[model samples]
Target: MKILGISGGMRNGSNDGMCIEALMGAKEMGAEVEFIQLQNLHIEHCTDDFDWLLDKMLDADGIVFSTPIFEKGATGLFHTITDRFGPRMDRGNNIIGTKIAEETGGTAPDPRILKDKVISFMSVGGSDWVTRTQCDAGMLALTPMWKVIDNEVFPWALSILVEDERVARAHQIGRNIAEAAKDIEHAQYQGDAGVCPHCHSRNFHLQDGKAICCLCGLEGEIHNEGGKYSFTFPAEQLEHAHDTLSGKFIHGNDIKENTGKKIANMQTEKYKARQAAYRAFITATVPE
Candidate 1:
């Protein structure tokens, strides 16, 4: 198994150290591992040879996404990486398009976009201020890949690694990633199950006695028993979970209907004139 380790929190700091430790665990599992520290790359808003990183990502069976909490969430680098590898590189949707094209005789998505990989997240923090600083939405909701989360290591401050228990948890996170990558078809999550049975996320969008996981769209119902609350998420909802192939097909169709149809039938009659008017309204300055 090939495991890629991404460290975006600090250069040789606690966060990066945990990332290395995780990779070490994967290495002990007999998996080939590679590590990358984004802080050392001097990347700006765009460019800076990001294509090579995507190539590395595509070739890996698993990726350990290690970042630190900033402003109660994952670091900005996670979002930056998300933007660069947006829906254009969705694996499940691309797989859908690829299979459909084999029957219909048309161009399919690039093979790079069809890679199947599992991802694990680790977010180190200075404080235990937020409930989900470790379980980042950027890590969960953004990717279509399978995820292996370790609830034990989820709250590592990394400075607390002297405790030794957190270090073992982090290593298990890596071992779990390699194990999942080795057999994705039958890989199982060993962490504490959350409210959403599918993605195992505590976060949800609740309204009108209905609950939907914000991470994977697992549908459920809210129950109240004298001010105490519980949820009943049906097993049937797994068919439509955002991480599944069927769910990806549903979202693909929805996007095609909403965005594709509009783009296909769009009119630019007054678009250029309005855009030109706005362009001239404010003159842009050259940095040089």
Candidate 2:
């Protein structure tokens, strides 16, 4: 599978792009992954300038938005690029429809469009928005028709007023995107839409063995135990844990307190085995 990685930061020695380390893991799993540093491309805010990049995204089996969090949100560069990738409307045919209309409307009318195209997102939050993760807030801004999956890596505190946590997550988030891209391609080649079980949503948050929903609350079963499902404790944050109560719960202990939520959000490096059967049932029916 061919996967594309888009880095939002354009600076000198930016740890921002370190998030692509996860992409390295994806290549190990039998994927042809390519990293596109936004810094290297002449991507401008012009509506037509970014169409070339969007065309690349349309051609790839999957795309990954990897960037460092800024002011509790994604970098302005990333936001601007996505603003042109697809339509802002979540209704009336969504991205798939808008793309098909633009591509075939004037020509001979080819409606294959960018349908079934999958997407995922990765952002590194710092001391300012670490608490909020700066993730859920920007979810809709660059909305991926497929889903923006989280890699289960978190900052060390309830409020992420830190930068190391973002660095740590960068590693896994990269791999998650690479793997998700490959999985989406294989599923498409096989005619499948990898769905979520709980909310019956088609957009998924792909992890090691299974995928979850980006909007609706849904969990899926893990089908494999390869490195894809394993979480790596970075050498830098190995001895780290939260200091406060809420921070600890969200960053540490609560992961164990809510057994079900933990299994879905934390604890399991990849897929929660207990929910495998339920997720399988969901995948079988949700997407068409």
Candidate 3:
């Protein structure tokens, strides 16, 4: 198994250190590993060096994203890099895109997107904002619509302070990721279950008194007995989670339909006028 670790934070900080600690653990597991820091890559913008980074991700069996959190999110460097990982990078979409391309006499999508890769995350906390990991999952893995379905959470670690316990957890995260690379569901997290069983996150949104997972979109019942409350996800609700393969297929099909319709309507006067109007609007911004 091959694992790639990418750090998006200040040099010599806890983020990079934590990432390397995890890499050492993966090394102990005999997984081939590599590490990269965006700070040294001269990435003023993704167009400069992100292609090479994306190529590395394409080749690896797994990726560990490590970033320092100041607020509810990672550094702007992380955003810049991940922004370029558009829909074309999704494995399921690539499968759909390629077959449709062949049938429609269009260029096939890149085979690089078809490779299955498991992923985990690590975050160094410098503030009270503990939601950085969720944002990381939302941005990279979970993505709100269709996730990197094979990804498991045993390896995702967080540290409010650079404590030894956190370090040990990061090490285990590395070992877990390596094993997960060999078999996506091989390594299991032996711990108390989180609020949600699927993604193990406490994040949720309410709709009509029902709790819906903000990350996976699974709906569950809020059971109350003698003033005690518990959330239970029904087996029938499994298909609703965005992390499922069928959910990924649904999103892929939506993309296919939308793109086909847009292309078919591209030459229409209404579509042309809408596009032209948007382009004609002047773009002004604050002075840097």
| Candidate 3 pairs with clashing backbones | none
Error of 2 at 165 (Å): 9.3
User: Residue pairs in steric clash, candidate 1?
Assistant: none
For candidate 2, the lDDT comes to 0.48
TM-score of each: 0.80, 0.49, 0.75
TM-score for candidate 1, residues paired by index: 0.80
| lDDT, candidate 1, 20-106, per-residue tens | 888999999999999999876754453455677877778888888777778767777766666666555776666777889988997
Model 1 misses residue 164 by how many Å? 1.7
lDDT of 3 by residue, 1-288 (tens): 898888787776667887788888888999999999878887665556777877888788877777776556666777766566654465556666788999999997677576556777766665556654554555566542322322222223344334777778778778877877787555444333456777666667777868987766788865558775567888878865676667777877788799999898998999899878888896667899
Stretches of model 2 off by over 4 angstroms after superposition: 43-48, 86-112, 131-144, 151-171, 185-288
Q: If candidate 3 were superposed on the true structure by all CA atoms, what would the RMSD be?
A: 4.8
Considering summed lDDT, which 10 consecutive residues are worst modelled in model 2?
A: 238-247
lDDT tens string, model 2, 193-278? Answer: 23332222234467876444443323444333664332222233322212112222243344346666855575574546656756
Candidate 1: residue 194 lDDT (0-100): 66
